[PDB]
Symmetry: C4
Subunit: 498 residues, 4 copies
Amino acid sequence: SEKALEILREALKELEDIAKEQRKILKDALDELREEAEKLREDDEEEINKRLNELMKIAVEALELTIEVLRSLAESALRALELLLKLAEDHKVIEEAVKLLLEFLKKLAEVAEEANRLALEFLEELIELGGDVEAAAKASKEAARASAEFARAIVEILEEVARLAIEFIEDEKLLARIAQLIIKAITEIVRIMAEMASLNVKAMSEIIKLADDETAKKAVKIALEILEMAMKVAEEANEAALRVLELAVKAGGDVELAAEASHELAKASLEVLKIMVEAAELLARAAIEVIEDEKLLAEAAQLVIEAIRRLMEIMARIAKLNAEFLARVMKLADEETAERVLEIITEILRQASELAEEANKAAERVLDLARKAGGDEELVHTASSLLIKASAEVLRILFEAAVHAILAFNEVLYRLLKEAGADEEFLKEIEIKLAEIEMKALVAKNKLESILSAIDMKAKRGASEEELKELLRELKKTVEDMLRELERLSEESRRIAE
Amino acid sequence: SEKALEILREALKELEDIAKEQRKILKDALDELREEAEKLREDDEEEINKRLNELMKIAVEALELTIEVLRSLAESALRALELLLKLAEDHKVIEEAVKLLLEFLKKLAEVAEEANRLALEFLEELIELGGDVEAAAKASKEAARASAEFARAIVEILEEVARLAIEFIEDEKLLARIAQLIIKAITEIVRIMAEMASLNVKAMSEIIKLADDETAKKAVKIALEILEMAMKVAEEANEAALRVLELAVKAGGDVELAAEASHELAKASLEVLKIMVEAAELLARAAIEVIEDEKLLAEAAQLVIEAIRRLMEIMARIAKLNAEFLARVMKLADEETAERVLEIITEILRQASELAEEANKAAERVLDLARKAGGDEELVHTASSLLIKASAEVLRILFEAAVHAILAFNEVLYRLLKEAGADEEFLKEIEIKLAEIEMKALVAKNKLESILSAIDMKAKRGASEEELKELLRELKKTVEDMLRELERLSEESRRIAE
Amino acid sequence: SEKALEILREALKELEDIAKEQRKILKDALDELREEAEKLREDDEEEINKRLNELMKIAVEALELTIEVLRSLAESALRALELLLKLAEDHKVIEEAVKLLLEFLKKLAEVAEEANRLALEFLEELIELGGDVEAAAKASKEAARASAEFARAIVEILEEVARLAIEFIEDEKLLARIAQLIIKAITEIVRIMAEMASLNVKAMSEIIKLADDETAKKAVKIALEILEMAMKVAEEANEAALRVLELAVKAGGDVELAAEASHELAKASLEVLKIMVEAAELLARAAIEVIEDEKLLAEAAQLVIEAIRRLMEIMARIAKLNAEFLARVMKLADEETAERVLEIITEILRQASELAEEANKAAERVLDLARKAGGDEELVHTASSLLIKASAEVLRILFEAAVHAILAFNEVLYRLLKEAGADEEFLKEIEIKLAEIEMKALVAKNKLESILSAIDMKAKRGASEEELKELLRELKKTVEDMLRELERLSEESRRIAE
Amino acid sequence: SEKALEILREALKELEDIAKEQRKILKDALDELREEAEKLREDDEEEINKRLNELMKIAVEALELTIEVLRSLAESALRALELLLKLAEDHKVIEEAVKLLLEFLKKLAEVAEEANRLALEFLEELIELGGDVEAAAKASKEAARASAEFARAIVEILEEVARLAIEFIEDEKLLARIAQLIIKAITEIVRIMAEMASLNVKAMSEIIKLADDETAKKAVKIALEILEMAMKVAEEANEAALRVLELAVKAGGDVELAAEASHELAKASLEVLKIMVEAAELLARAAIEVIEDEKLLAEAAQLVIEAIRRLMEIMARIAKLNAEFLARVMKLADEETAERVLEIITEILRQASELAEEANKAAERVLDLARKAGGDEELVHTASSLLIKASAEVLRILFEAAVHAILAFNEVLYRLLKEAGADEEFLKEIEIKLAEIEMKALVAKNKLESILSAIDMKAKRGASEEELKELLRELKKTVEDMLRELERLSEESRRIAE
């Protein structure tokens, strides 16, 4: 039993050591490359303009190779855990092995972040030397894409570890613990990936300082591209984490603990999307302060606006998906953990609305920094219209999620009353009051849709921004009023019940 | 029981209210757009020529959006009925709920027609201002296409309501009532859609007044296009209505009542195709009186002729399809409701032949208005040849339907005699006389095909129109004589039977 | 019983009457077209050059339409027989009905041949007037293609009648009679189709008289195209006839009678391919005597050579397929009908070899008429090489068929000895002598392949024609010697048996 | 029994005779072609330049035809064996028949090699006459491709014979004998095919002597192409031979004998890949000594380097595949034949490493002959980098195979201990020590991957060749040390066991 845990501990220690040695090998090769570049700095314009691009290309190739080595190390660690699980029938050693393997994959993603940071700081030391700016930006984007690929591979290995633990586990007290531990590890991986992407965006922001109008615009374009792919990694980590929590719930893992795990996952990923908003806003600030035009200025500002639009949409989508998972788990849960899950869903949706509002403040700050820098006016108006439309979309989706939570909680109240052997006429009265809840909820949803339609009509027509802000304030008042009324009606249904 | 009916009544009242409020929102936004256009009328030629097109584009976007809101309201009303059906085991409340929901979907399609009328009257107020004519026609066609999409969505929701009523219903007296009520609602929807399309064609007819020869021809082209898509909606409404009547017949719904429902459906849809013929004829009159050419005149006249050809063909197809459904239901029916169904089929085919003849009179009026306005002669001859061919095609198809009705009635007489335990030699004599009926029917069909072939030969060769009219009179005499003879032979078979 | 036969007789009489009336309608319309053309002959060069082509196009449209009417009549007659078969349990009336329906489809294909002859004689009366030659040839090819389509439709209706007779029949004495009657009808249909194609080729041969070098070459090209599609109809009629004979054999139809039916089918289709060879040779004679060149002369001669190559190949393929069917039926047959089937297969292969040799004489006559008219020499050498290769291919295939017949007869002798309860050691000696037969047969086949390879090597190298004729004489001597030896070895095996 | 063996002996003697006669026919036709060419040599420049190419084309057509005849002979011999197997229940005659048929297919491939040699010597006698060089090279490549197609057809016939013997055989002592005999025959076929390809490469090497720089480069290109397709035939022969050995093992064929058969197969195919390396090196020597340039010289040298890269890769792949087969058969084998199989795998991997090192020496000799002849420097550096990468790849793959062998042997030791009914705690200790073996093996594999990654990083960066040679020496030291340590750990596990 414990001897298998010690053998896996030794193998994971050796894999951590080889990962550290591979990072040192990357640093050595990057140092050699930088020394060659510095030696060539003294010894034509075309010579430098060509060799610096070749050197950044082979340096990104070296980073991609070290990412491949680290991913192979991760797969071998997963295979080691697979060996250990087979070699063990006990639960204590199994849980200890999963904890140790999650720690190791955390350290491995940390080494990968250090390798990415080395590649980007070397690209900076190269731009010091006078290399290209479009080529440097492209090499940086390739670095970030290989890093995001490593993040996805680690997420899949974490999902496979969760699946092995589910398959070779017969208890709930421990299986839900493994669920929450795997979820903590996935949030850690996505935080490290978002940190890598934020560092790469800051590097592009320090690159655009010495670039031509068009070259700076291309740099901003592919910096928003790397932010888009980091967002894709965040969404994929969320989906895999939620798959893991669904598997355990399916296997009987504690209900309230899985609810707390999904809440913590939603919180961590909303913080990740917030830090990506922050990175995009810093990039937009630098672009506006260096782009130096009247047309490409507004073009880069509008492109950052599309990135923030996608950030808002992904915030809303992750909030809706976690609210729906909590709704299913509520459907399965209990008399009182169901109300705890409804309260937790309300918490997650309040957090998502707050972060969507912070994203709107970020986009408004970017559009004001584009106004003060004197950009195109049509582009700025279109960006403001797009943010009004996107904020309305987030209000719509979060309201739909809250209504779905209220419906699921009412259905759980009814399921509890039916299980507790109440009267038939009484249960008919409860099911008709729940039908009332659903009718008024559908009506509220379509009323929200109608008011959103009116706002979008005025927006595409080209209304003033102050006007749309007041109209959106009205829509928010209406949606909050309708949620409060629907909650009051559901509570009166519950009171009629008991 | 009744409480669920009242809850659904309240939800449908609120959905009717939100639909009315959405129509008011559309009117408000259209008023704002029209005021902006009028304010710009006073304040370049390019400025106006561009902004008026942008304004018509965003106004049609507003109409498309209000159609989307109304369709979402329809889906939510269907979901409300789904809730109510589940919440009810009683038949009276179920039937009352279906009646109320059909009334609501009638009012919803009415609101959609009002929204379409607003969009078209606004496009007219815009052409008053001097916008484009091709762009105005394209915006009008987009409006009509979104309206036809709403009509199809309502038809599918009606079919889903009929299917829910079929699934949650255990009786024939009431289930056939719901069948005929859903069919009345589908005829109402298709009448409203045809009215929207006729109004849009009249709007295009009032547009072509101030358009260039080619611009007027493009306007006429896409007005016939909107008539084609309204015809497609009529055919789809027929197919869905017939699917609904087949489902109930399958479930045991009264036979003679389903026959009366299919007869009324055929009658209403033939009136719809008649009003579309009328709209196409008015459009052709206006085009000929404004196109002002010798080549594009005949081109627009020939295009209206192709539209009338398609109208004739769809009249014939709907008549054949309803005659075939009545033939199947006859196959299932009875001793005497079978003869009632044969009489009703004769009525439907007489009505279809009368409306095909009225369509031929419409096309002849259009070709005479093209002759008097001095158009191309080859195009007019080709149009007359196409109408002779299409009228012959309708005669062929309606005759095939009548023969199929006679065959089905004879088969029902034989099935009745076999069920009533008659002799074996006697039943053999009856089945051989029915084989006689079928032999002479096949011969009659191929004789009609041969005479039609001779007419088409003379037509493609380029015969005179008076000549083809006399030859078509001869073909009609022959087909009526053969139908009378086949009916007499079948009646003599029935007399030999009893 | 007999009353159903009389009712079908009446329906078929009426369908024959309507077919005759449709032929009269075609003659009337063609007469009207020819009168219009003659009236225009007196009343520009472009006027005539355009209107004559339009008139031939609409005349071929009239022919295609009359073919459609005749095919619909055929389908209705099949449906009448279907009614009659259902209406009858007796065998005598069923057989009489099938005989009458085959007679009717014979008369229908005869009317179709008369219609084709009318269309082609009208195209001739038009070329008298001075129409195009390429357009006239294209209209003639379209006429022949519609006629071949009618021939295929009739073949499929004959196959369907054979299948109905098989399905509704319980005896062998009569079922094999119906098999041989359907086969006679299919041979009649393919003879009529080949006659239509030969008449069309003769019409093209009388057209090329007044055509330009290139126009005459195009006429010859598409005349060989119509011969190719008539060959396709012959092959398809063979395949459908053989499918019919296989079905009956499967159903227990007399074995020796099915063998005689396949022999007669092979004989008739070999005569059909012979008459197509004759038509191609007449076309080549006319082309060579009118093409009047040194390059296009040899081009048309080489194209006729490719047509004759395809004729040889299809002769060989039909012979092989019928020999294989007889081999299967032998496998099923008997002690002595098996030897009768082996003798009949020898007869069919002798007939196929004789007709392949006649095809070679036809191609040699064509190449001599191209030599005497002074054509290109490379093309003539390539044509002679292609005929040597094709004659060698036919020798190979027919020898393979004869060897397959000998193998099947030996296998039947062994099956008979095993069924008749002979000794085990004795049956082992017989099966090893049959293995000897198969070994030496495989060796003979590959020796034939090797000698054919040597001839083809010398041919592609460009050997003299007299030389290849002597080498082919040697290959024929070798194949006949090996067949005689293999037959002697099989007969000695049979003698060792008994 | 024996009589069937004698009948098959007679048929195979006749097929050998016809093959010999076909070779004589090819020689006769080639002699005639060469005489025509010599006669034309005396009797324009364009005349010769065209007719010599036409003559080489038709000569390669003659060779392709003789290959087709020989393949048909092979198929007929397979069919003869199929007859004989059916005709025999005894094992002695069956084995004698398979031995005789393998001898015959050996003689047939020998005749095919003689035909290929005749075609190539005739192409040489033609280049004596002054034909093209690109066309001669293309004709030679077509000859070699048809020869490789014949080699593949023979390999498939050998696999089919092995499958027939497996299907109609009930014993292991004899079935494993047939397995090893079929494997010897497949090694013989692949040796003959490699000899044909080496002769063709030598012919191209004697062709490039009188070719233009670009023409010589094209000749070298397609000579390496024929070497590539001969390598493909070697790999396919290996795969089919291994399929055959797997089938017998599946059927119960002796285990240790199948291991010896796979070892001998691997040895023979490694010798084949060695002789292909030798042919490529001779071709590169001739090219460098005749190409006479500074750019195309290095281009041809780099192309030979890619061919040697593919040779190294295929050596490694065949070694890995045979080691994996021996690992499976070990998994099935025994207590001591398992250690014999581990020793044999060590032998095969030592042989594969030695031949990969010889391939590296060949490529280094080619690059030194390109350095001394003064070629491009970038191309030579890229070739040296490619060989360092390929040698590292072969080290990686062979080490993976050796580790897989050690894992399989440990698993067999554990399976033996579990079968021999040892204690449960004892078996748990053994399975945890085997888990130790697997952990340290995974760590060793990823350490090898990391060091290989560092070498490839330095290589793509453009390190010096002496430097990479020392780094590769270090990687080899590390891999040998890790294999020795893993073997010592496994042996200590086995000692703890017993």
